[PDB]
Design a protein around this ligand. Structure first.
Ligand SMILES: *[C@@H]1O[C@H](CO)[C@@H](O[C@@H]2O[C@H](CO)[C@@H](O[C@@H]3O[C@H](CO[C@H]4O[C@H](CO)[C@@H](O)[C@H](O)[C@@H]4O)[C@@H](O)[C@H](O[C@H]4O[C@H](CO)[C@@H](O)[C@H](O)[C@@H]4O)[C@@H]3O)[C@H](O)[C@H]2NC(C)=O)[C@H](O)[C@H]1NC(C)=O
Ligand SMILES: *[C@@H]1O[C@H](CO)[C@@H](O[C@@H]2O[C@H](CO)[C@@H](O[C@@H]3O[C@H](CO)[C@@H](O)[C@H](O)[C@@H]3O)[C@H](O)[C@H]2NC(C)=O)[C@H](O)[C@H]1NC(C)=O
Ligand SMILES: *[C@@H]1O[C@H](CO)[C@@H](O[C@@H]2O[C@H](CO)[C@@H](O[C@@H]3O[C@H](CO)[C@@H](O)[C@H](O)[C@@H]3O)[C@H](O)[C@H]2NC(C)=O)[C@H](O)[C@H]1NC(C)=O
Ligand SMILES: *[C@@H]1O[C@H](CO)[C@@H](O[C@@H]2O[C@H](CO)[C@@H](O[C@@H]3O[C@H](CO)[C@@H](O)[C@H](O)[C@@H]3O)[C@H](O)[C@H]2NC(C)=O)[C@H](O)[C@H]1NC(C)=O
Ligand SMILES: *[C@@H]1O[C@H](CO)[C@@H](O[C@@H]2O[C@H](CO)[C@@H](O[C@@H]3O[C@H](CO)[C@@H](O)[C@H](O)[C@@H]3O)[C@H](O)[C@H]2NC(C)=O)[C@H](O)[C@H]1NC(C)=O
Ligand SMILES: *[C@@H]1O[C@H](CO)[C@@H](O[C@@H]2O[C@H](CO)[C@@H](O)[C@H](O)[C@H]2NC(C)=O)[C@H](O)[C@H]1NC(C)=O
Ligand SMILES: *[C@@H]1O[C@H](CO)[C@@H](O[C@@H]2O[C@H](CO)[C@@H](O)[C@H](O)[C@H]2NC(C)=O)[C@H](O)[C@H]1NC(C)=O
Ligand SMILES: *[C@@H]1O[C@H](CO)[C@@H](O)[C@H](O)[C@H]1NC(C)=O
Ligand SMILES: *[C@@H]1O[C@H](CO)[C@@H](O)[C@H](O)[C@H]1NC(C)=O
Ligand SMILES: *[C@@H]1O[C@H](CO)[C@@H](O)[C@H](O)[C@H]1NC(C)=O
Lengths: 101, 480, 136, 136, 136, 49, 49, 49
C-alpha cells in the first residue's frame, strides 16, 4: 500500500531558522530520514525513529507515536539544505525540498 | 531489627539465561569410534539420550528462536566435524592434468521411457548426453612412467573455454581456485539423529505450547536433560526428514512485513518424495602416487535415460493449498501466488540434497507453479542433475570430490517444511500475493527444530528472611 | 520460606510454587548440581572445560558457605540482622506467594552487602569463641 | 565394627582383618584417595582426564557425606534405624569375623534404600532444629 | 597470634605486620586462593593444567583441615599439646614481633610431626565421642 | 619405587588372558611409534626406476 | 633463476636535482636488487610460463 | 627509568657478560623506504599464490 507520504514538499527557510518536515507511515515499521546534498550522494541522518546517525550534530531530531513522525532541524545552516527522504524497509517518500533564502 | 534476620539457602531452584558448550549425545548406538564413521564416531559420545521430561506447575518463560545460539553451536560443530574428517583423506592435486574429452558412446542399451533401443545420446538425453568421456595422462607410482587412463565426468565438473574455444581440452573446475580432497570410503556418514545434553549445572527448558509463533512467552513449559533426536540433514528450498506440528501448518518469521526475512513454513502432514538414479554405475579405480587411489565412474551399464524425483500430485497440491490458506490468514484480503525460483546459484536455484553419498540437484519449476491459495484448477516428475565436485557449504572455501556409488541408487524422504521469501517493491495492488522458494543457511534448517529449547544456568544459592537468629531468638512475622 | 524436603522429584520440577513450598527440593538441586552426566579429536578439551567449570562453580559456592559457618548444611541460620537500609520488604508475599524465581529479582542490586555482613559477623563470632576458650 | 584409628600403614595394608580392626585405617585411605601421584603430544588429555575423574569422584563422595550430616568426620553416627525389612543380619560375624571386603558384598542390593533414608532423616532433623531456634 | 579479621584489603596487603597484626586477611586469602582468574591451539592444555593444579591444591588443604576436625573454620583450636621436644620457642616475639613470613621459617624442620599428632588426637577424640554416644 | 605392601588374609582371583593392561600397552606403543614417525622424512621421491 | 641488472623507466632521484641516469650511480634499492625470470608450473602441471 | 641512565650486568669485570644500558629519555628514530613497491602476484599449484 502507500506506506510513506511526506509533507510539505516545498519549503523556504532562511539560515539559522528551524525547519519542520512530517512523514506519515501507514503501517507499523521502522522509520528514518535522509539528506540529499545537491548533486551528491545522499546519506543517512536519523534511523529507528529518533536515534541520530553517526557524526550528525544535535540539530537533527524527531519523534513519533504510531503513524505520524515530525522531523525538526534547529538552526539549519547553509550547507545543511537539500532534499530529505522518508524510508521504511523498501519504500521512499516523495521527498521534501528546502531551499535557502 | 529485633524480629528480622537473614538466612542462607542452598540448592534453591533459580536459574538465569547464560550460554555454554553442550554435550553431543548419540543414538545409543550406531557408532564405531575408529573403524568407520557414521556421523561422529571419532568425536561424539555414545550415551543414553533418554529425555526424561518434567512438567512445571506455574512457570512462564520467554523464548526466541532467532536468537537461539544452539543453532550457531550446531553450525560450528558440523563445520569442525567435516573439516577434521576430510583432513586425512586423499588430495586431488595430481589429477589436474590437461584432459581431452569427447561425447560418450553406448553399447546398445535400452531406454526406460520409450519402447525402443538406444539410438543416439542427444535424444536419449539423461545421464548419457550430460556426461563427457575424458582421457588424460597420469603419473604411475614409479614417477618415471605415465599411461593413458580414462574416466567419465559430469559436465559441471569440467571447464572448457579457458583452454581456448577450439581445443576440446578441459580442466577440473576446482583448480582455478583451490585443491579438492576425496571423501574417504570407510568414513562415509549419514544423518544419524543427534541429541544435545546440557553440561552439569545447566538445564535445557522446552516449550510445549506448539502453536506459539517463535517468540514471546510460553506457559506449558517443561524441563529436559537431553533434547530429542535432531537429524543433521541439509537441503535447500525444502526441509525433509523433519518433525511435524500437532496443529495444522505453522509459519514463523521475525517480521512478515520485513520481506527480506525468510519465512519458514512447518507442515503437519508429510508429503512423500522418492528420488532415484537408474542405471548401474561401474566404479573405476585408477592409481595415483605410491599408495593413493582415485575413484571415478567408468561405463554406465543398463538402461540410462533417467534421473528423476517423484511426488504425489494431490497430496502436495492440498499441502500447498493449506499453506496458502494460512498465508491468506496472515495477509488479509489478498490472494497467494507461488512462482518459480527467483534465481541465484545452482545450489539454491534448485532443490539440493544427498542420497547414498551422491549429491542431487533438481529443477523445482514444476512444483511451485501455483495460483490463488493453491494450484490451478498422477505424479509430478522433477528433472534433476548431479555434481561430484562440491563446495562444502553454500560458499565456504572447503571443496570436495564425491566418489561415485555403483549400482542404481534410490532414496525416500518425508517433506515437512518449506523455505520461502516474498516479492519486494510495490506496486501494492499486484505484489503482495507473490511468494517464491528461496535458499537457506543451515541455521534456517536447524531453527525449525531448535525453536523449542532454551539453555539456562542454575543459580543454586539464595538468601531470604526467616524466623531464626543463630542460637539466640525467634521472630514475629506476616502471612498472605 | 521453609519446608520438609524430598528428593524423589529427580530435578527442577518446582520451581513455580512459593518459597515455602519450593524450599523442599534443596537435596535434589544440591545433588544434580555436580553429579553426571558421565582419529585425533579436540572435543576432549571441550568436555574437560565443561567439567572444570562445573567443579569450580561448586567449589566457589561451597567456599562461600564455609566462610559464613554454613558448610555442612543446606538450610543455615545466621546472626546478621536485616539491615537498617530495608525495614520494608514484603514478607506476606515472601512466605506463601512469591516463588524463588521471582524473589531472586527483588534481592538483586543488594546481594553484595549480604556476603560482607555475613563474613564480618562470622569472623567476629570466631574470635569471640577463641576469647571464651582462652579463659578456662 | 570400630577401632582406634591409625595412619602408619602407608596404604591399603589392611584389608583382610575384621571390620573391628580394618576400621582403624580410615585416615590413610582417605588421604591416598586424592593425593598424588603428581613434540606435540596428546597424553596431557589422558592425565587431565584421570585427575578430573579422581577429583569428581572425591567431590561426589564428600557431597553425599554432607547431605547426611556427616561432612567433617570419618566415623559418623546417624539416626536412621535398622531397616524394618532386614532385622536379620549376622552381627556376631560383623564385629570380629567378616572383613570389609566380605561385608560389602552383603550390604549390596539394599544400599540404595539407605542413601534415601539418611537424607530424609537429615532433612527432617534440619527443619526441626530450625523450628526449635525459631521458637524463642 | 589472633585478631578481628577483614576483607576490604582485596589481597595480600599484610604481610609484613606481626602475626597478631597479620592473621586477619584469612577471609580474603581463602577467597583468592581458588577464585578467578576466569586455528587449532594447545594452550587449552596449559589453562586446564593450571586450573586442575589449583583445584587439587585447595582440595588437599581442605582435606588436611577435615582430618583434624577443623573443616568449616579458618581459625581452629585443637587438643594436641605443645611438643615434648620443643618447650622453648620465643613466644614474646610470636605475639607482636614476628610476621608470618618469618615465623614460617622457624616451624620448618618440625611441621611434619604436627600433622601426625593432630591426626592421632582427632581420631582418638572421634572414637571417644562415638563410645560416649554408644554408652547409654 | 614400587613400595610393596603385604596383606594378611586377602584372597583374589587373577586372570592373565583377560588382563586389559596388555591392550593398554598395545595402544600406547602404537600411538608412540605413529606420533614419533609422523614428522620424519617421506620416501615418495625415491620411488624412481 | 636467470637474472640480470634492473632497468628504470625514467624515474627521479631524491638525493640530487637530476633525473635517474644509471643504477650504478643511482645506487640504492635499484642496483642492490636483481631482476630474475624463471620457468614456473601453471596449475594444470603440463604447461609452464 | 625514573632516575638517570642505568647500567646492568651480573659482573662488569666479567667482560664477556652483556651490559644492558637503560635510558631515562627516549631518542626518536625515523626509518623509511621511499618508492612505491608494486606487489606482483604469481600463481603456484592449484590454490597457492
Ligand atoms: C531420510 O529418511 C529415510 C528413511 O525414512 C532415509 O532412507 C535411508 O537412506 C539410506 C541412505 O541415505 C539407505 O541406506 C542404504 O540402504 C541400502 C539398502 O538397504 C537395504 O538392503 C540391504 C541389502 O542390500 C539390507 O542389508 C538393509 O538392511 C536394507 O534392507 C544399503 O545397501 C546401503 O548400504 C551401504 O551403506 C552402508 C552404511 O554406510 C554401508 O555399511 C554398506 O556397506 C553400503 O555401502 C545403505 O545402508 C537406507 O536404506 C534408507 N532407508 C529406507 C527405509 O529407505 C534417508 O536416507 C533419509 N535422508 C534423506 C536425505 O532422505
Ligand atoms: C516416477 O514417475 C515416472 C512417471 O510417472 C515413472 O516413469 C515410468 O517408468 C516406467 C519404468 O520404471 C516406464 O515403464 C515403461 O513404459 C513403457 C510404455 O511407455 C513400456 O513399454 C515399458 O515396457 C515400461 O513398462 C513408464 O513408461 C514411465 N512412465 C512415463 C510416463 O514415462 C517412474 O517409473 C517413476 N519412478 C521413478 C523412480 O522415476
Ligand atoms: C527449470 O526448467 C525449466 C524448463 O526446462 C527452465 O525454463 C526455461 O528457462 C530458460 C532460461 O531462463 C528460458 O529461456 C528463455 O526462452 C525465451 C523464449 O521462451 C527466450 O526469449 C529467452 O531469451 C530465453 O532463451 C526458457 O524459456 C524456459 N522454458 C520454460 C518452459 O520455462 C528453467 O530455466 C529451469 N530452471 C532451473 C533453475 O534449472
Ligand atoms: C483454494 O484452492 C482450493 C484448490 O486449490 C479450493 O478448494 C477445492 O480444493 C479441492 C481439493 O484440492 C479441489 O479438488 C481437486 O482439484 C485438483 C485440481 O487442482 C484435482 O487434481 C483433484 O483431483 C481434486 O479434484 C477443488 O477443485 C477446489 N475447488 C475449486 C473451486 O477450485 C478453494 O476453494 C480455494 N480457496 C477459496 C477461498 O476459494
Ligand atoms: C633523513 O635525513 C636526510 C638527510 O638530512 C633527508 O634527506 C633529504 O631528503 C629531501 C627529500 O626528502 C631532499 O630534498 C631535495 O633536496 C634537493 C637539493 O639537494 C632539492 O633540489 C629537491 O627539490 C629536494 O628538496 C634533501 O636534499 C635530502 N638531504 C640531503 C642532505 O640529501 C631525509 O629527507 C630525511 N628523512 C628520511 C625519511 O630519509
Ligand atoms: C570412453 O573412452 C574410452 C577411451 O577412448 C573408451 O575405452 C576404449 O574403447 C575402445 C573402443 O571404443 C576400446 O578398443 C579400448 O580398449 C577402450 N579402452 C582404452 C583404454 O582405450 C570407452 O569405451 C569410452 N566409454 C564410453 C562410454 O564412451
Ligand atoms: C624485469 O625483467 C622483466 C622480464 O625481462 C621485464 O618485463 C618485460 O620488459 C620488457 C621491456 O623491457 C617488456 O617488453 C615485456 O613485456 C616485459 N614482460 C615480459 C614478460 O617480458 C621487466 O620490465 C624488468 N623490470 C625491470 C625493473 O627491469
Ligand atoms: C546398436 O544397435 C544398432 C542397430 O542394431 C547398430 O547399428 C549399432 O552399431 C549398435 N551399437 C551402437 C554403439 O550403436
Ligand atoms: C504452470 O501452470 C499453468 C496454469 O495455468 C499451466 O498452464 C502451465 O502449463 C504450467 N507450467 C508448468 C511448467 O508447469
Ligand atoms: C630516460 O631519459 C633519458 C633522457 O631523456 C633517455 O635518454 C632514456 O632513453 C630514458 N630511458 C631510460 C630507460 O633511461
Amino acid at each position: 500500500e502507500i506506506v510513506l507520504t511526506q509533507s510539505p514538499g516545498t519549503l523556504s527557510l532562511s539560515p539559522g531558522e528551524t525547519a519542520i518536515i512530517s512523514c506519515r507511515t501507514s503501517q507499523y515499521g521502522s522509520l528514518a530520514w535522509y539528506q540529499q546534498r545537491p548533486g551528491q550522494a545522499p546519506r543517512l541522518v536519523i534511523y529507528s525513529g529518533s536515534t541520530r546517525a553517526a557524526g550528525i550534530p544535535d540539530r537533527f531530531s524527531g519523534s513519533r507515536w504510531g503513524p505520524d513522525y515530525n522531523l525538526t532541524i534547529s538552526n539549519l545552516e547553509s550547507g545543511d539544505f537539500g532534499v530529505y527522504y522518508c524510508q521504511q524497509y523498501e519504500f521512499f517518500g516523495q521527498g521534501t525540498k528546502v531551499q535557502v533564502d | 531489627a529485633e524480629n528480622l534476620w537473614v538466612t542462607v539457602y542452598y540448592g534453591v531452584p533459580v536459574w538465569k539465561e547464560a550460554k555454554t558448550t553442550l554435550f553431543c549425545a548419540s543414538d545409543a548406538r550406531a557408532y564405531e569410534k575408529e573403524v568407520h564413521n557414521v556421523w561422529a564416531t571419532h568425536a561424539c559420545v555414545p550415551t543414553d539420550p533418554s529425555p526424561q521430561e518434567l512438567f512445571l506447575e506455574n512457570v512462564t518463560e520467554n523464548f526466541n528462536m532467532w536468537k537461539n545460539d544452539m543453532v550457531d553451536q550446531m553450525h560450528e560443530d558440523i563445520i569442525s566435524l567435516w573439516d577434521q574428517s576430510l583432513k586425512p583423506c586423499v588430495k586431488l592435486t595430481p589429477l589436474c592434468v590437461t584432459l581431452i574429452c569427447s561425447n560418450a558412446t553406448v553399447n546398445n542399451r535400452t531406454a526406460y521411457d520409450t519402447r525402443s533401443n538406444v539410438n543416439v545420446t542427444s535424444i536419449n538425453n539423461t545421464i548419457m548426453g550430460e556426461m563427457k568421456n575424458c582421457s588424460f595422462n597420469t603419473t604411475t607410482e614409479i614417477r618415471d612412467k605415465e599411461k593413458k587412463e580414462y574416466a567419465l565426468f559430469y559436465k559441471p565438473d569440467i571447464v572448457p573455454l579457458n583452454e581456448t574455444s577450439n581445443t576440446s581440452e578441459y580442466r577440473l573446475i576446482n583448480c582455478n581456485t583451490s585443491a579438492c580432497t576425496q571423501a574417504c570410503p570407510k568414513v562415509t556418514f549419514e544423518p544419524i539423529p543427534i541429541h544435545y545434553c546440557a553440561p552439569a549445572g545447566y538445564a535445557i527448558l522446552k516449550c510445549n505450547n506448539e502453536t506459539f509463533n517463535g517468540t514471546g512467552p510460553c506457559s506449558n513449559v517443561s524441563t529436559v536433560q537431553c533434547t530429542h533426536g535432531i537429524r543433521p540433514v541439509v537441503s535447500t528450498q525444502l526441509l525433509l526428514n523433519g518433525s511435524l506440528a500437532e496443529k495444522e501448518i505453522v509459519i514463523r518469521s521475525e517480521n512478515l512485513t520485513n520481506n527480506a526475512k525468510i519465512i519458514i513454513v512447518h507442515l503437519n502432514t508429510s508429503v512423500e518424495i522418492v528420488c532415484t538414479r537408474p542405471g548401474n554405475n561401474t566404479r573405476k579405480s585408477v592409481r595415483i602416487g605410491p599408495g593413493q587411489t582415485f575413484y571415478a565412474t567408468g561405463d554406465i551399464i543398463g538402461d540410462i535415460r533417467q534421473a528423476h524425483c517423484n511426488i504425489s500430485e494431490k497430496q502436495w497440491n492440498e499441502t500447498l493449498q493449506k499453506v496458502g490458506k494460512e498465508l491468506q490468514k496472515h495477509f488479509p484480503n489478498k490472494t497467494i501466488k507461488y512462482e518459480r525460483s527467483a534465481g541465484g546459484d545452482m545450489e539454491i536455484a534448485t532443490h539440493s540434497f544427498n542420497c547414498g553419498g551422491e549429491f542431487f540437484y533438481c529443477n523445482t519449476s514444476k512444483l511451485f507453479n501455483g495460483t490463488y491459495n493453491g494450484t490451478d484448477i498422477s505424479t509430478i516428475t522433477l528433472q534433476c542433475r548431479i555434481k561430484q565436485i562440491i563446495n562444502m557449504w553454500q560458499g565456504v572455501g572447503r571443496c570436495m570430490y564425491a566418489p561415485p556409488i555403483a549400482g542404481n541408487i534410490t532414496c525416500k524422504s518425508n517433506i515437512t517444511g518449506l523455505l520461502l521469501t516474498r516479492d519486494g517493491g510495490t506496486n501494492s495492488n499486484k505484489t503482495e500475493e507473490t511468494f517464491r522458494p528461496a535458499g537457506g543457511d543451515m541455521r534456517d534448517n536447524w531453527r525449525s527444530e531448535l525453536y523449542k529449547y532454551k539453555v539456562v544456568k542454575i543459580e543454586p544459592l539464595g538468601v531470604a528472611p526467616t524466623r531464626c537468629k543463630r542460637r539466640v531468638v525467634g521472630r514475629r512475622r506476616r502471612r498472605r | 520460606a521453609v519446608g520438609i524436603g524430598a528428593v524423589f522429584l529427580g530435578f527442577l520440577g518446582a520451581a513455580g510454587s512459593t518459597m515455602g513450598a519450593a524450599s523442599m527440593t534443596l537435596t535434589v538441586q544440591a545433588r544434580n548440581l555436580l553429579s553426571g552426566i558421565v582419529k585425533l579429536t579436540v572435543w576432549g578439551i571441550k568436555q574437560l572445560q565443561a567439567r572444570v567449570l562445573a567443579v569450580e562453580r561448586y567449589l566457589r559456592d561451597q567456599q562461600l558457605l564455609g566462610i559464613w559457618g554454613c558448610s555442612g548444611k543446606l538450610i543455615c541460620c545466621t546472626n546478621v540482622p536485616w539491615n537498617s537500609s530495608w525495614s520494608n520488604r514484603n514478607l506476606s508475599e515472601i512466605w506463601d506467594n512469591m516463588t524463588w524465581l521471582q524473589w531472586d529479582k527483588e534481592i538483586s542490586n543488594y546481594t553484595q552487602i549480604i556476603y560482607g555482613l555475613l563474613e564480618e559477623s562470622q569472623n567476629q563470632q570466631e574470635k569471640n569463641e577463641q576469647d571464651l576458650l582462652a579463659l578456662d
